[PDB]
Amino acid sequence: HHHHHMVINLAYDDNGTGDPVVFIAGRGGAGRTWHPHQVPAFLAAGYRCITFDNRGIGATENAEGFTTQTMVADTAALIETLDIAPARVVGVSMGAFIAQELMVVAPELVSSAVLMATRGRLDRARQFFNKAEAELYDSGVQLPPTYDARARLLENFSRKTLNDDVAVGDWIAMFSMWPIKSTPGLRCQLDCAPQTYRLPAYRNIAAPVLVIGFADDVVTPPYLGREVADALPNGRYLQIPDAGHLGFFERPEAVNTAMLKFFASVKA
């Protein structure tokens, strides 16, 4: 348990009534990124949905010097403040890493979890990708807007989507509804990632977990998600075809139905 933490106010929304589900967004994602595709489906299934702005987002976008354990403690504090322990947790990418590490140190707060687009370590390519992203920020160079959108398309969507002229046009426009500003908080979130080999620690997590991998994901490749599921004694792996790193936007029905079926299967 943390002993060097200071609670800060994080924006959050608390919607619906019933069993609580805490959503943890990935790097650069605000709480509202769960609202186009996930929260309506979960509300329709009868869940209460908690979404929030991670440290480094929005009102804390200039925060720096925080670590994964800071964000774990932030999430734990939100669960305790809302008096929703134990909660279901849905995390994606950085948010799934936070969820994993939360379950290691405070398992009593999490009844079950979905971990989307996750890993328990970085391989050579993904370590290099992170070094390159940090180098881009630290150089002060700003990518021109269309080139930034091109990188976002390549890095987040399936080949099937890129080959779909209408879908591609739509996602280019979606980028205006979900800008990712280069902030100090975004740069610090880049380091809130597996710096070490965390799979052995996850063998201690006894709670039921669904790990979802996205077949075309190049940011968190599916084989690294399968490693997490294999470490988890009560974790199962599911792969979504024709889905990139943003698979929960790209194939929302497929992802939601898998998550809702899992959460129903572990009902108390």
* Rounded-to-integer distance, Cα 237 and Cα 227, Å: 9
Whether residue 71 is annotated as binding a ligand: the answer is: no
Across 58-144, where does the E strand assignment appear? 87-92, 110-116
User: Out of Na ion, its own copies, none, which partner does residue 9 contact, by CB within 5 to 8 A per kind?
Assistant: none
1 has catalytic annotation: no
Q: Is 174 in the site for its own copies (CB under 8 A)?
A: no
Given its own copies, Na ion, none, residue 235, with its beta carbon under 5 to 8 Å by kind, binds: Na ion
CA distance 120 to 195: 9
- Catalytic annotation, pick one of 53, 74, 216, 217: 217
Site for its own copies in 109-168 (CB under 8 A): 123-125, 128-129, 131-133, 135-136, 139, 141-147, 149-151, 153-155, 159, 162-163, 165-166, 168
Q: Does 235 bind Na ion (CB under 5 A)?
A: yes
CA–CA distance, 229 with 202 (Å, rounded to integer)? 9
1: CB partners within 8 A, 6+ apart: 105, 106
176 binds, among its own copies, Na ion, none (CB under 5 to 8 A by kind): none
Rounded Cα gap, residues 58 and 207, in angstroms: 32
Catalytic-labelled residue, pool 93, 111, 112, 158 = 93
In the list 77, 85, 172, 190, the residue contacting its own copies (rule: CB under 8 A) is: 172
Distance in angstroms (rounded) separating the CA atoms of residues 257 and 251: 10
Query: What per-residue string of b and e applies to 156-193 under the rule 16 or more CB within 10 Å gives b?
Result: bbbebbeeeeeeeeebeeeeeeeeeeebebbbbbbebb
Separation CA 23–CA 92 (nearest Å): 8
123 an active-site residue? no
Q: Which residues are annotated as a binding site for substrate?
A: 27, 93-94, 126, 245
Residues that bind its own copies (CB under 8 A): 123-125, 128-129, 131-133, 135-136, 139, 141-147, 149-151, 153-155, 159, 162-163, 165-166, 168-169, 172, 216, 218, 221, 223
By annotation, the residues acting in catalysis are 93, 217, 245
